[PDB]
Amino acid sequence: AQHAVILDQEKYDRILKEVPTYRYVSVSVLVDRLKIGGSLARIALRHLEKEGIIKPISKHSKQAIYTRAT
Amino acid sequence: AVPSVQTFGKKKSATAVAHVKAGKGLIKVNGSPITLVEPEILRFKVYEPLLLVGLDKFSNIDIRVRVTGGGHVSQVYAIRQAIAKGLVAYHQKYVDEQSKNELKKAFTSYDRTLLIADSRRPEPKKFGGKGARSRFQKSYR
Amino acid sequence: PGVSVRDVAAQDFINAYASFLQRQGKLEVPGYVDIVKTSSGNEMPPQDAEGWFYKRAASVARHIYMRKQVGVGKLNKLYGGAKSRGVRPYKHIDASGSINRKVLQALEKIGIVEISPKGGRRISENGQRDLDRIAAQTLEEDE
Amino acid sequence: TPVTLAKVIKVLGRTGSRGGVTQVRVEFLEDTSRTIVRNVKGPVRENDILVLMESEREARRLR
Amino acid sequence: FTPVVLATPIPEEVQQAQTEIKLFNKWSFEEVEVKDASLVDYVQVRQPIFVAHTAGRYANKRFRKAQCPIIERLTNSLMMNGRNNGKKLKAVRIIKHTLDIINVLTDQNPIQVVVDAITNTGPREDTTRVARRQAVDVSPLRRVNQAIALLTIGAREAAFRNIKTIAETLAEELINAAKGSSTSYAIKKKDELERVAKSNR
Amino acid sequence: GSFQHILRLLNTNVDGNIKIVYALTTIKGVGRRYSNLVCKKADVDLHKRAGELTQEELERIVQIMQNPTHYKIPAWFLNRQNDITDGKDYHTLANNVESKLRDDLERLKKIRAHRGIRHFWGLRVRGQHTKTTGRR
RNA sequence: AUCGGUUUCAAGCCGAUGGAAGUUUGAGGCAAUAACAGGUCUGUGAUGCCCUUAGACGUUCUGGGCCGCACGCGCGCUACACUGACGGAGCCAGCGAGUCUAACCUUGGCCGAGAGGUCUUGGUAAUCUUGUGAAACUCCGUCGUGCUGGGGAUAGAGCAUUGUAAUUAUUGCUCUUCAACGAGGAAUUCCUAGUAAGCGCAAGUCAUCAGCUUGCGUUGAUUACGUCCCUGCCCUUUGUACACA
């Protein structure tokens, strides 16, 4: 494919351990962990926000910023 | 037999006519509340005349702003100025010059367009250029 | 207690009126939908393509409300954007006629828009009622 | 890492091919009464502090 | 604090700005001081403001842009590489983002960290072409001017052909400049201009 | 799972990666607009990544691509309309693109039509100014 | 202007305050003496002379060419993308111009995916086009560092409009074809504030054709507030074998 950007239901399990203990979370960080690429990074952020491991500080389109759950 | 003063504020071809009248607190722009101005960052440029003195001073008036001309930013600066100039013109005429002084040096302490329009105007275009200065490229050889 | 179409935000209103006009199967779809890009000067069709139309319908409703009387020409030159003419400088080519005409006809049949004197189209009294009802719900849904 | 802060007391025209450098007279804030002549690059008013990485060497015009 | 009512209901977060303090709507200019002399009376952190956008008559006479709030000076210097010339609304939105970014990681109130980045990325001795090079000292206004012009150029060059958006890059550059790293087109690019100086100094 | 990569489709390799509306257009003879309209008539899901389309709906993609007029494509979405041979509107979607391109140039050169001759010489055929342009 | 500085306390200059405005307030128009063998005889029933004066070197008609392409150069436009593209929604200017014995600016409603057609309509115009609800811009979402959906060149077929006439494709529109281009060597241009730059808009030619110009607003920086280093300028001194210098 293109540097580990593949659709998976196991890297769901990889995400939901690796994403917490991040001081900062955004599309840029998710992709720069050689994970899910862009389209999949955004819908990962949206599901992590529904689940409530993420606190959204700002949610502007094109630049969504997030933090670890208190 | 009602306190009513028609003021205007302007920034580069943007005419914002405010109508500050004796009322409760109805501050509205193009028949919509100030809380809905097109640029959502310039929400705090239209608002700053209220946050400068306090909403307690606006607890006994109603303002209606009609904006025409310019672009989005020109129109926000026009509203901001029109509201501040409206409020000081009301306080001058219907309260006293003491409280007018008070909120004049309140408004001009935090730096101003706000009371009197920036003098700046566009310079006309002259031949052999794409603007007032920028000349076309020169071809020696 | 006097919430109108103007008292509510632009997008946050149109999105709730989009939900409402989709729940109701009352407003028509011209049939050529899925094969149009609502312009002469665009690249690709509307990305949603699940009847956007319910967003045009909503916005032409909200626009004709705020204005006095709007014609198809005002809607075309409104919705039309900058056409990339290739290597030549960008222009203004106005949006597609049929979409804006057939959505006005769809509002006319539903009873939102009324064929108005001075030409063009005004809002119906049923139109103002339905718009203001949604406009009140939108705000109190958050509150 | 000793960097010496010194306020300017007077500006003296401009040196260099162009007016890129301004010759200035500074007084050392630390252990004052010491007046030294120095070159700057950017625009200098009076009362402005410059950070010397050497308090020793004097300044000459840039012919 | 004193939640007043009007015929136009204002939200309480906006109503907590009236003479309370002027922030962005969250970043305070009480202040964690500039802390480095020579640049005090050259960084404006004394006049608090709501947005990083005034009409501004700051390029009027000579030294007037020293009495412009330093947040606007970044916001201004982010509009270069002239596909973004003008467009201050985009620039202030990027500034809003990068500030709440350098909040969410390494908080420190995201104005004093921006100020500290200006104090550290300022080239404090340079040279002049007199093919010779003569080492001269630097005016504190130019130390700010070039500190901004290194941070904001480094940012766009990093964010160019990348996934890291200008907001996150500028943010990372301001953080590593504040805490002297030499890993942000930063202290590295400044040391390169003080290295050519110490040759002739 | 069964997520495929290469996805061969009518004599081309259309990698079952990021998106399908944009994968189909790597076929020489369909574009972003046409691919989109065929995907819509195929009733495929567009958020899927071109690899998780089971072969039955891939066949239907190829069906509507090959014979578009049957499945409500309006006949102004096609390459050859009022074709010179018969007068029947169809879409040249496979290697037919260059096949019919060559056939048209060969038809023009056979007649010895001006555009055909300029096609033969490798000159620019749309009466463009080639004094200062088309160097290499 | 006032106040303070500041030069033999003279003309002035610098700083602060007030003021819409403190650079000649910003920008232009007008603009000397002398000069060029600068351009124009293709603007002129402006014109000397010379050439032709009907098998015309006059102006009319048909068609052709000014567009022809190994190559070089100058003004431009578009771009090499994530500060982005695309889709939706949000949605605001300023200077224009516009038809009677003619075909202008053209609302409005219908037909059409288009482009564009129809049947009416207001305007000889601060009344109508027209708020020219322009674009960049704003927000929500779809693309995720790949010549990629950046880029849109070349080509293929079709549908319209203008025009006696569209072929050497007028222009517009639809679908398909997708090239170079990963920020550019030696060089060189323009620019000091509502200016540069981005953005479009109106006017000129115009039946049709703007990637041009003349203007106008929209968004709106960085960096000087200086000096003769380069390239030239103005005044004085000085050397000269130069004077079409």
User: CA–C1' distance C76–G170 (Å)?
Assistant: 27
CA distances from residue C83 to C39, C42, E184, F37, F46 in whole angstroms, order as listed: 9, 6, 40, 22, 26
Residue B50 DSSP code: H
Enumerate the residues of chain E whose CB falls inside 8 A of the CB of residue D40. 136-139
- Say whether E176 counts as a known binding-site residue: no
Give the C-alpha separation, C8 to C132, whole Å. 10
Chain E's closest residue to B62, CA to CA, is: E7
User: CA–C1' distance B83–G53 (Å)?
Assistant: 84
User: CA–C1' distance C81–G200 (Å)?
Assistant: 11
Cross-chain residue pair A7–F3, CB shorter than 8 Å:
yes
Q: Do chains B and C touch (3 or more CB pairs under 8 A)?
A: yes
Q: Which domain holds residue B21?
A: 1-141
Q: Give the method used.
A: cryo-EM
**Chains with ≥3 Cβ pairs under 8 A against C?**
B, F
Instruction: Please tell me what resolution, in angstroms, this structure has.
Output: 2.9
B94's torsion region: left (phi>0), alpha (psi -120 to 50) or beta?
Answer: alpha
Interface test with C, best of F21, F22, F24, F33 (most C CBs within 10 A): F33
Chain C's closest residue to F41, CA to CA, is: C34
Helix (H) or strand (E) holding E137: strand E134-137
Q: How many domains does chain C have?
A: 1
CA angle E111, A26, F22 (to 5 degrees): 135
Q: Measuring CA to CA, which residue among C89, C123, C105, C143 is closest to residue C5? A: C123
Q: Which domain holds residue C127?
A: 1-143
Beta pairing, strands C121-123 & D35-40: unpaired
- Secondary structure (H, E, C), B68-101: EECCHHHHHHHHHHHHHHHHHHHHHHHCCHHHHH
CA distances from residue E43 to B64, C120, E140, E187 in whole angstroms, order as listed: 39, 58, 10, 19
Does the CB of E68 sit below 7 A from strand G? yes
Q: Which domain holds residue E35?
A: 1-201
Burial per residue of B104-132, b for 16 or more beta-carbon CB atoms within 10 angstroms, e otherwise? bebbeebbebbeebbeeeeeeeeeeeeee
Residues 6-65 of C with CB under 7 A from strand G: 10-11, 14, 32, 35-48, 52, 55-56, 59, 62-63
- Secondary structure (H, E, C), chain C: CCCCCCCCCHHHHHHHHHHHHHHCCCCCCCCCCCCCCCCCCCCCCCCCCCCCCCCHHHHHHHHHHHCCCECHHHHHHHHCCEECCCCCCCEECCCCHHHHHHHHHHHHHHCCEEECCCCCEEECHHHHHHHHHHHHHHHHHHC
How many CB atoms are located within 10 Å of the residue E148 CB? Answer: 21
Q: How many domains does chain B have?
A: 1
Q: How many domains does chain E have?
A: 1
Give the C-alpha separation, B34 to B85, whole Å. 16
